[PDB]
Amino acid sequence: GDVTVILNNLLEGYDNKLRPDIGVKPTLIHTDMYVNSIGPVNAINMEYTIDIFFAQTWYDRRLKFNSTIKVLRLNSNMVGKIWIPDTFFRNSKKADAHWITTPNRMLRIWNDGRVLYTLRLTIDAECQLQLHNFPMDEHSCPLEFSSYGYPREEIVYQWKRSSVEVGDTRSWRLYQFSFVGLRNTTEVVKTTSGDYVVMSVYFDLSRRMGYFTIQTYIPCTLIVVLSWVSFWINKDAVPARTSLGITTVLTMTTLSTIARKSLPKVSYVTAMDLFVSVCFIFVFSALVEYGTLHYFVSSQPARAAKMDSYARIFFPTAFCLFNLVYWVSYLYL
């Protein structure tokens, strides 16, 4: 009817290569979000997937009409005919919009030129996780976006009061972590092209213990007590105790290999590989202890007789102590 006439009059003499107020003042853009789901935070690649509903609203004095209807509600068929800011996410490894069934976009042009442009995004953002205190580690890693070609003098972004609003936080794929909060931030960065207004949203993730508790901690403590079981077998049966020790060491090294294979290749010492190393040391010390016991039986029997009962008490106490120390320290750190 008459909406066609309005849409035709708005696009007559319209240049979608020139930002609104090209030579007057910067374009103020209000940005909002809606975090559908924060995908799996895989530490191997130092990345994390997020799915959002990015909304940008600005003023365009050229899309200003005067009719009874207050707002024009449009699909993605008129997004490529007006000016649209070139917002890109500066820390996204790979991100893409949605196109099924029709491009997931929305355009609402109000009466006074106010434009609202909303789209659906799935961003594989990047954040370098400091994998210390693993798996008792907490991260707070961002999602940064800014204009690409327009510096601070042309495009200025600005958060709304209720900009970022998470969803239900229950049907998310955060397996090993747990969402605890977020915060928005605005800064200005320097590039070879100019000064840009960079907005950021920081998501706070806390690694919940569990999978690792049952994948490496329990197996290794159970291997340690298995190695302690050798201290009660009589000292005359050599092959039994040697088999115990050597097979326990083999299982210990296999479990350490797996545990380190969990997280990526990092050249520093974490808190999990420290644990498996202490357990390895324990097993190796029980085996060399039995070796010295068997060697001393030939030299002095009473020495070995006292040594066995000495170790039976010295090993579990040293392990309880180690555990206590370790756990308390890391839980306070």
Binding site: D15, K17, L18, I22
Partner: protein, 46 residues
């Protein structure tokens, strides 16, 4: 206004423009200066 002036300038620049011909299609070569700002070296596979 300033917007009309900019619009007319851009419409003049892009009118009568041939993409098939590099700048100075007969004379000296064009000098293209390169800048690179490395964001990240992601993964190095052996």
């Amino acid at each position: 206004s300033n917007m009309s002036l900019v619009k007319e300038t851009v419409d003049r620049l892009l009118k009568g423009y041939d993409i098939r011909l590099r700048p100075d299609f007969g004379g000296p070569p064009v000098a293209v200066g390169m800048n690179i700002d490395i964001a990240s070296i992601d993964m190095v596979s052996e």
